[PDB]
Amino acid sequence: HVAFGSEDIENTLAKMDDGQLDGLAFGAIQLDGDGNILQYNAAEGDITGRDPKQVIGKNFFKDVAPCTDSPEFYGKFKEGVASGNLNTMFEYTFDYQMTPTKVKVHMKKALSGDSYWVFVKRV
């Protein structure tokens, strides 16, 4: 088990494969520094209606999730990528190619130093 917002969430998830990530209680997306989707779990697809198997490789901010292209989400992502001190939490509404859905979001640098987690749960 691992809870949304856990202080060491990035440690726990670093040890996980696809199946384990698919079993999480919350949506989990891993992005590279450019916002390309590296991983996308089953729980996230349950929130958004995206097929996880097919969004891999797409750009989260340009193509998949344009409603997050804003200072409030994408702006915070780029600030944290640039600082090396991505770890930030906030509320948001997802409303592109889905019923508007209120969520809470947590972004955090992965240990694969290279990538960046985006965590989502319904509120």
Q: Using DSSP, how many helices (H) and how many strands (E) does the chain show?
A: 5, 5
Binding flag, residue 66, ligand HC4 (CB under 6 A): yes
Return the H-helix or E-strand segment holding 76: helix 76-83
Binding flag, residue 68, ligand HC4 (CB under 6 A): yes
Q: How far is the CB of 64 from ligand HC4 (least distance, A)?
A: 5
Structure letter (DSSP) for residue 73: I
Helix (H, G, I), strand (E, B) or coil at 89: strand
User: Partners of 120 in the beta sheet?
Assistant: 27, 105
Contact string 20-59 vs ligand HC4 (x = CB under 6 A): ---------x--------------x---x-x---------
Binding flag, residue 90, ligand HC4 (CB under 6 A): no
Structure letter (DSSP) for residue 45: H
Of the two residues 66 and 80, which places its CB atom closer to ligand HC4 in the complex?
A: 66
Query: Which residue in 94, 116, 117, 119 binds ligand HC4 (CB under 6 A)?
Result: 94
Helix (H, G, I), strand (E, B) or coil at 28: strand
- Interface residues toward ligand HC4, by CB under 6 A: 29, 44, 48, 50, 64-68, 94-96
